[PDB]
Each structure stands twice: as structure tokens, then as C-alpha cells.
Amino acid sequence: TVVATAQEETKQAPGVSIITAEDIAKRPPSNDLSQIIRTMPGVNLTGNSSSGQRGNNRQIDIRGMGPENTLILVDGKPVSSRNSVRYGWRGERDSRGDTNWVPADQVERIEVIRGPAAARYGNGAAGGVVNIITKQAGAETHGNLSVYSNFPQHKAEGASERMSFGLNGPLTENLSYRVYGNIAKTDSDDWDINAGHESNRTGKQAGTLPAGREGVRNKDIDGLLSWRLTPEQTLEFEAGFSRQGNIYTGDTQNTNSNNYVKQMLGHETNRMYRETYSVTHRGEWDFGSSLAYLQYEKTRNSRINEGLAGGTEGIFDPNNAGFYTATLRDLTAHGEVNLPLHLGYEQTLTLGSEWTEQKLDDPSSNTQNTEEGGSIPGLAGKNRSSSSSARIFSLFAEDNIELMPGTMLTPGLRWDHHDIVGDNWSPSLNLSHALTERVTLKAGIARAYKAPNLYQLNPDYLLYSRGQGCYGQSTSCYLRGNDGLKAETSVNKELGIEYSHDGLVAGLTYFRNDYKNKIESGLSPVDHASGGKGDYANAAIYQWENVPKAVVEGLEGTLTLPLADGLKWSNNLTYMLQSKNKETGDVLSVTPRYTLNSMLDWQATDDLSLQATVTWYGKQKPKKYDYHGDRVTGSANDQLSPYAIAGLGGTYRLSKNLSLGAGVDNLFDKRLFRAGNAQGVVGIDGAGAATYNEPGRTFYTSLTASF
């Protein structure tokens, strides 16, 4: 009886969680799937950057590794769209992330793959992988129509509404389709949600506010045709078109303001179009199995002009009104075969390759001139190229070996060639061992890989500061892209033991990542520019640089008890032991010290299902040091205290064809307000860890019609 693939076997590793379509129906998200993905152990909902900048745009972070290290897939194929949004000095991006491209109600399941089992997915999988799997066609035609709406207690918070539909099944005998569409709106929080809560602001900056959450408008449609060519051979064509337009509520990099900002409150100021085309060929043959695919993803990011420095740094530029478009083109090709091998040991060999190209055209990002800080040899002050690109060819070999009943060994090797950075080697080993019929011991260790992003790699990408931003000094500097960077790598390990029997589950996992060569803004000048104006002349030139060592470490626990026949109590716990940049001694990603998610699920009748949830978060602590590397003082030290969020909801099945849902999130109305960024600037104190809004009590209803 044949052994599963490497890819399939390692989905049982300690660092993997699965969220089902039924889980999504019972705990419906407002809009972005991050709202449910974040409730898995070892997962956090975090700002992109430890600076706090754009800190209400929280995203899925795995094991404290930061959202940039979460690789998002849809049906196994990569999402790159956030790479069209400029990556700044502090790793900030004015991006909502990549977990909102698929509507929740057309999702079959979600694989959350954390740590060593994720390394095999290659570039970007150092934190882990989130693979969003869409519902597919079956034998008969089926379909659905799903609506969701919510209702905040406090009018300052944005309400969401959402309507989607699927239809799939045969068209002819050889030919079947699957299509879905979706329309959604999450309103923005109000411009003044955080008035009463903001960091102290003086002088010019009196009256300024940190913004609440940005709104979004989604239109998605997808079409897939599946064509059964030979008995061995299916060919699938799929095109997807998504648009997200924002609803602006005053976010700016440093939380300053001007009239162009005040004028755009409530309007669309950024729009993302994502176009996807894929062809997928599946074979079922005598020898085993094959899969190949080609995806082209085109992302257009159009938004209002902002400055890179000066008075218009990270804010709409009133002297260059209007919008620009950055374009990202990402082509991914993949092939593999899966070979059951019967001699010696039972095992299943996977052999494959992948090629990717990323092209970025960004006409706002490479425009910093050198007139103030002085000129930089090899860098033209003006008219630098918009474009950047990189290609990675990959080879891999994996084998899933049943050493003997109850024991599996799963070695793999990936090799990657990046046409600028060079070669990478990602060795992989995961295993499971049955200690008794009820208890299993599992371990993993691997080296994940992440290539530099195209901003960090580009010598034409140049940022400038008069002093505030410069590490180890107070005079003016430049930060320049560096096309000799190393790749980041992370040796990620876990050890897990788990009791499992009769739907009772008790489990504990320890994890640690030794994160190598994380790419960050440099700490020492490599050089000095020459000329410029006044005190600012002859600016220091820093580069994007590899940090030698960082570490995350902690524990994930799970406890699921069957209290009675229709009644199940599920809990998971994550405890962060470390998240440290070992060069700066500072925090890598600001996450709660612990997160405990608890759910009581009651099948009250055949037709009626009720749920209660509570989540407890521990303390959050900000960066110790400012951009200079000096000890932060004052309110920039502020920490968030522990807090809990509770909810209640249910589903009532009116028939095979109609179900309704209702409930309340954050039942005791526990709210937090964004006070600012972590550290301050001239006129505006920092706010430490108080960098985000936690919404209050919010009621919701849903209806799903299906056949």
C-alpha cells in the first residue's frame, strides 16, 4: 500500500496546521483571511516593520520571523503582489499584504506550514508557508452563493460586507469548469478614531493623528476550465482578475499631515490590480504521478505620489499631485514527478524543478537625487532606471521512506541558482516515529532560503536622511541598494510529541530558527558622498547589509478535549522565548509574549451549531533602540499589557440548501488604539508597542445558499 509523497507526508509535521472550509464557516472573517489564519499556533498578526510605520496594516507572521518571511500560495502557486510596493529603510511597506486575494467562502482549506516542513517550498519560506486552496469541481454541477455583513458597536470602526459565488461541474464529458466571483467592502476606520489616544505632538505637529485601519474594496473573479485529455491526462486553464481599491483614512509614514492628506480622507488613494494566468497539466500514469504548471502574475500598484525624503517623506506630495503605477511581473514554472519505489524500503521519490522570474518597474522608488548630500560615484543623480529583475532556477529531490511501520524519514535537497546572488543549498529532513499506538514523536530540521528583494538588491535604489535616520551618527546619510548581498538562510528545527486518541489531542512542540544574513539597513558607512549643500554635504553612504545572526525560539501547545458527544473544547498555546537580532541586540518582530486560543464547539442540534471563543495575548514590548542605535526613552518604551478577546456565534441549517450564521466578535468590547510609531520624530513622540487598532465589539450575519 503506497507511501505518500514528501510534500504530503510533511503536512503532518508538528509545525503544520490545517484550516477547513467548515472552520471558516463557523468563524467567518470580516474580509482578509488573515483574521482566521492568525488563530493557528505559532502564528501572529503583526506590522511589517518594527518601526511601527504603516503599523495598522498587520499581516501574517510565522513564529516571530516577520510577515516578509511568510510565503503565500494559492493552490500551490505563489503570490508576489506585495513586492510591487516600495520596501523602505525600516522594512516598512505601505501594503495590506497578500492574504486578501481569495474570497473566504470559496476556500476549500488553508495549509499553514511553519518551520522545517516549509523550507522545501524555497525562496520566501523561512518563516513558513500559507497555502490557500480553492474549492474545485467534482462530478455533478454544484455551486454556491454566500453573503456576509458586519455591524461594529462603535461607529468609528469600519464595517464590512461581502458577497461571493461559486459555480462548477461538467459542461461536457471531457470538460468541466470552476468559476467564482466576489465583491467586498471593508470600510476604513474614521479619521479621528485615535483622537484621545495619540502620542504627544508639539509645534508644527500639533493636531496630527495616527490613523486607524485603512479600508478596502475587492472585486475578484476567477475561471478555470479542466479538460480531461487522455485517461492519464488533465489540463487546466485558469485566469484570475482582482482589484483592490483602498479607503484612505490619513495614514502617513511618520503620522504627520498636510492638506493633500486631509483632502483625500475617505477617498481611494491606492489601487492594486492583480492578474493571474496559469496552465496546469496533471498526469496519472503507470509509474506514478506528474505535475507541471506555468503561472504569470501581473500586479499593477497605482497610488498617489509621495516623497522619499524632506517635508514630503512618506506622505502625499502636494507639489506632484496625481498617481504613478509600479508594475510587477512574476512568471513561475514548475515541474515534478512522483515515483513509488518498492525495493529495499517502501518509499516515494519526488524529483522536480522550478524557474521564476521577477520584473519590477517602479518609477517612484529610484528618484532620490544627490543634490543635498553630495554625489555618489557609480550612481547618476537623475533619471535612473525604473526597472529591476532577477531569476532563480531550482532543482530538487525528496524521498519519503517508511523505515518500518510507524516510522517515516523524509530527506530532501533543494538547489537554487539566483542569477545575481548565486547558488543556494537547502537541505531538509523531517521524520515521524510512533512510540505507542497513541503517541508520536516528530522532529525536523532544514535550511530555508530567501533571496534579497529587488529594492534591497538595486544600486539605483537610494534613500536619504538629514540625520534622524542615520545609524551611529547624527549627520546626513544615504542608504543604497547593494547587489552583492548574500541571500538570507534560516536553519529551522522543531521537536514535537503528541498524544492522540478518540478525538483527544494533547501535544507540545519546541521550535528554534537560526536566522542567517537577514537583510537590513547598514550600521556603518562604507563610504562618503562628495559635495552637496551646507552641513549636509558629503553625506555618509550606508548600504543594505546582511546581519550575521538572529534567532527565534518558543513553544506551541495543543489541547483538544471531547467534553461530551456534541461538545468539543479546543485550545492552542504559543509561547515566544526569543526574537532577537543578535547584532543590534534588538527585537526582530514585535509579537505578544504568548497567545492562547480557546474554542468551545457545541453541536446543539442536528441543525444548530454554537461556538464560543476566547483568545488571550501576552505583553508586547517595542524596540529598545532608535534609528541611531541609542537607547529609546520616554513613551517610546511603552508596552501593551496582556488582554483577551472573546466571541460567540452559531450556524443554523435551514435545509440542505440554506444555512445562516450570526454572532459577535470581541464580546466584552476590549479596544486598543494606535498612538503612533515606535520611536518619535521632531514634534511627535513615539508610542512604543501601541502601534495598531484592535477593533471593538462587532456583530455579524451570514447566509450560504448551495447545491
UniProtKB/Swiss-Prot annotation:
Residues 8-135 form the TBDR plug domain. InterPro entries: Plug_dom (IPR012910), Plug_dom_sf (IPR037066), TonB-dep_rcpt-like (IPR039426), TonB-dep_rcpt_b-brl (IPR000531), TonB_rcpt_b-brl_sf (IPR036942), TonB_rcpt_CS (IPR010917), TonB_sidphr_rcpt (IPR010105). Keywords: Cell outer membrane, Ion transport, Iron, Iron transport, Membrane, Receptor, Signal, TonB box, Transmembrane, Transmembrane beta strand, Transport. Disruption phenotype: In a pvdD and pchEF double mutant background, when grown in iron restricted culture, able to grow in the presence of enterobactin or various synthetic catecholates, but fails to grow when enterobactin receptor pirA is also deleted. GO terms for biological process: enterobactin transport; siderophore transmembrane transport; siderophore transport. Residues 140-707 form the TBDR beta-barrel domain. It holds the Pfam family TonB_dep_Rec_b-barrel. Residues 43-63, 196-215, 358-385 are annotated as: Disordered. Disulfide bonds: none annotated. Induction: By iron and enterobactin. A motif (TonB box) lies at residues 1-5. The keyword Secreted does not apply. It comes from the Bacteria. It is a multi-pass membrane protein. CDD domains: ligand_gated_channel. GO terms for cellular component: cell outer membrane; outer membrane. Specific receptor for the siderophore ferric enterobactin. Belongs to the TonB-dependent receptor family. This is Ferric enterobactin receptor. It comes from Pseudomonas aeruginosa (strain ATCC 15692 / DSM 22644 / CIP 104116 / JCM 14847 / LMG 12228 / 1C / PRS 101 / PAO1). The lineage of its organism: Bacteria, Pseudomonadati, Pseudomonadota, Gammaproteobacteria, Pseudomonadales. The gene is pfeA.
